[PDB]
Structure formats: C-alpha cells, structure tokens
Design a protein around this ligand. Structure first.
Ligand SMILES: [Mn+2]
Ligand SMILES: [Mn+2]
Lengths: 131, 131
C-alpha cells in the first residue's frame, strides 16, 4: 500500500512542442510493471490545447473542472464538461483543451505499450480552434 | 471518440457480499480490447467499506470527496483524503471505505487480467475496521 498525499507531487508545465498556450501538468501515478496504466491531471488556461496526437492503446479522459473542447480527425469540435468521460481509440488522432474563455481540467488515463503512451504531431491551428 | 455525458451512466448499489454497509457505485469506463484498463467511482456512506480483496494487476485510487480509511493485510489503518493517490500491489489483500462518521468517494482504476479485475474475500469485521 502506498499513499501519495495531496500536494506531494510537484506541478509541471506542458512543453511548447506539445501544447498551444499555457498548460499545467499535475502528475498522479504510473503503475509499475507488470501493470501498464498511468494517469495525470492537466489544466488548460482559456484558449490552450494539446497538439494533434494519438495513443497506442487509447486514452480515457474524466473531466474534473471547467469547460473544454475536443476533436478527433474528421469529427466535429465537441464541448466537454465535468463528469463527462471521453474515450479515444488506439491510433485515433485527436486533440483536447480549454474552451476560448474558460480553463478546463481533466484526469487522463492511458496504458503504455512497450514504454510509450503518446505520439505527438502538429499543433492545432487557430482555424481548427473554433466551433 | 466516444463521450459518455454526465448523468448517462446510472448509479448502482454495492452488493452485500462485497461490501459492509451502504455503498453506491457510479460506472465511469471500461476500455474495449485490446485495452485492459477499467474504472469506476465508489461512494461509501459512514462506516461502509469493501470486504477484503485483491486485484490481479493492482489498483490505484484517487480520492475525490470526504475522508476514508484503507488497510492492507498486516498493516495499519490509514486515512485517505481528497487528492490522495493510493496504490495497492497486484495480489495485495486490502480493503478501503469510509471513516466511521464521514462518507468518502474515490475513483478506482484497475487493469483486468482475463476479464477479471478483483478477487473478493471475507468481510472486514467491526474489530478489523476500528483497531
Ligand atoms: Mn489525448
Ligand atoms: Mn480495491
């Protein structure tokens, strides 16, 4: 049994390669072998969002605060709210982040496949960032 | 990309064989093969807790409301509070629940191994719950 107490993990920032705007990453866990799951919290300032990317075994999002936007390639831009659970499929190309006037926070959970849980791709343009 | 909206997954009740007291289960997700990860929210009313049990691939908790207790076998009873992250090893026998006078809600994340994410065992006695 191991307990990581609230406040004991330092907050970080989202690398400018992988996010447009100001984004905070709050780590939570990464199960050790032979389990593969990891997770963390991510807070997006208004207008901020991930770049396009995919996950090798998909990813689950549990929105925990605010109001955000998300979109897979070919899909419409959807608004997401606290309590909504979002599932992206393996290899599914997508982004997510805040809405233009409100931040958003969600818990993200994904399994690692031989070490890897993400593949980053191009930024979401201001033309894409609209609804 | 699939969104399950807040309010779309009905609450259910913890079965008597797996819980002492009143427990509510709010489903969150189960990822389709080849992803093995699953998760749900559980709300324990004061005094309610799981029976003792184990998880084949361990379990991670993220407490989201109230104030609860948890224990692994041979271990002390520990308080867990919102924002705390708890990790139980694969195979580790344990239980968790509300404190005697406060409810607690957490998010539980576990990998399945052959479509099984838990082995249920004997109830936690009043004597084990306090002392
Ligand atoms: Mn993602
Ligand atoms: Mn458990």
């Amino acid at each position: 049994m191991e307990i990581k107490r609230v406040g004991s993990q330092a907050s970080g920032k989202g690398p400018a390669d992988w996010f447009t705007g100001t984004v905070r990453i709050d780590p939570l866990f990464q199960a050790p072998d032979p389990a593969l799951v990891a997770g963390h919290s991510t807070t997006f300032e208004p207008g901020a969002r991930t770049a396009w990317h995919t996950h090798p075994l998909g990813q689950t999002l549990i929105v925990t605060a605010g109001c955000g936007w998300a979109q897979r390639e070919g899909g419409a831009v959807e608004e997401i709210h606290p309590g909504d659970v979002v599932w992206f499929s393996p290899g599914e190309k997508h982004w997510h982040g805040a809405a233009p006037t409100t931040a958003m926070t969600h818990l993200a959970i994904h399994e690692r496949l031989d070490g890897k849980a993400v593949d980053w791709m191009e930024h979401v343009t201001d033309e894409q960032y609209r609804r």
